Amino acid sequence: MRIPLVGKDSIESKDIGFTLIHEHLRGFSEAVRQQWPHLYNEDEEFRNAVNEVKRAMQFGVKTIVDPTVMGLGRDIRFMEKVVKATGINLVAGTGIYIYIDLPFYFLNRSIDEIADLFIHDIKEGIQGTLNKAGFVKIAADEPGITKDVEKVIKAAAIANKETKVPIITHSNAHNNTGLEQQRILTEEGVDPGKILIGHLGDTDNIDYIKKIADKGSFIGLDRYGLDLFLPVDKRNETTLRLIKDGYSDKIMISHDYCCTIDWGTAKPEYKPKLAPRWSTTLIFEDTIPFLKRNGVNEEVIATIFKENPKKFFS
């Protein structure tokens, strides 16, 4: 009974089944939602999340891993409601999503104190419930590895060493942050196979992606549908190249779809080809059909969506 599930008994990692490793039922900025609730509609967010999860389940998804944590509006009670309405296996996490500095709370606080928060969520439960965290989520982006970003990385390592839960990262695919996260974590004693370096699908720089995979970590081809980062076709070409080059056992695929997100995200670009529908099921409509008619067999699909998550959580 290794993996805790929101609203359910824990499961053995071998029973995780077909998994989407990086999806968000909902995201928001905690301070904005607290201060201006008039901007939000929880009933709509709930409806949208339930509908997305149901669609994923209709394609055979058994488990969704949701790396919404501090900074993205994690809400374990909202999550448990979606579980009750759908029956999905849902893995919640702990961690901190920042790009530059920690909240003012953390002034004069140690890396140990930060890790203690993560361990609290893993061992005791999230937000005053008995729903426990099954992984740690950390981030770095365009600002790089700042002092406070590094603190969070080292705290995640402590949590992994104490509880053995894996680590999912957010990185910027064009500035070495993913490579740096992997290096810092492994220097702290984290098993490379317990790390998913996120958002590498945002680049077609295959040498960079392979470098991280070759160092032992999973590679997150995890933003299918977000053309602003990289178009689906380019992603598909990169995914296919990696598969034919033998990297199936390191590849993890997801959409990073946010059923609701409060970010402005408002600047449209129209290409010759119709824009694909970003959702939690685009890979079933586009990517997986594309791979199969390019000779990718069922065993590859099982490796990516079943065996790799199983290993990650083992």
Q: Does 41 engage in binding with a copy of itself (CB under 8 A)?
A: no
137 is in an annotated binding site: yes
Q: Does 105 engage in binding with a copy of itself (CB under 8 A)?
A: yes
Query: Amino acid letter at 175?
Result: N
Least CB distance from residue 116 to Fe ion, whole Å?
A: 24
174 is in an annotated binding site: no
292 is in an annotated binding site: no
Q: Does 256 engage in binding with Fe ion (CB under 5 A)?
A: yes
- End-to-end Cα separation, the chain, in angstroms: 10
255 is in an annotated binding site: no
25-57 as b/e: b if 16+ CB within 10 A: bbbbeeeeeeeeeeebeeeebbebbbebbbebb
DSSP-derived 3-state class of residue 277: coil
Report the partner that residue 264 touches, choosing among Fe ion, a copy of itself, Co ion, none (CB closer than 5 to 8 A by kind).
a copy of itself
24 is in an annotated binding site: yes
Query: Amino acid letter at 5?
Result: L
> Contact letters (x/-) for a copy of itself, 108-147, by CB under 8 A?
xx-------x--x---x--xx-------------------
Question: Residue 259: CB partners within 8 Å, gap ≥ 6?
Answer: 24, 25, 26, 45, 48, 49, 51, 52, 280
Contact by Cβ (8 Å): 232, 284:
no
Q: Does 198 engage in binding with a copy of itself (CB under 8 A)?
A: no
170 is in an annotated binding site: yes
Which residues are at the interface with Co ion (CB under 5 A)? 170
Q: Does 37 engage in binding with a copy of itself (CB under 8 A)?
A: yes
Q: Closest Cα to residue 295, out of 232, 243, 238?
A: 243
Interface residues with a copy of itself (CB under 8 A) are 28-32, 34-38, 69-71, 73-75, 100-101, 103-109, 117, 120, 124, 127-128, 262-267
Interacting residues toward Fe ion by CB under 5 A: 256
Binding site per annotation, positions for Co(2+): 137, 170, 199
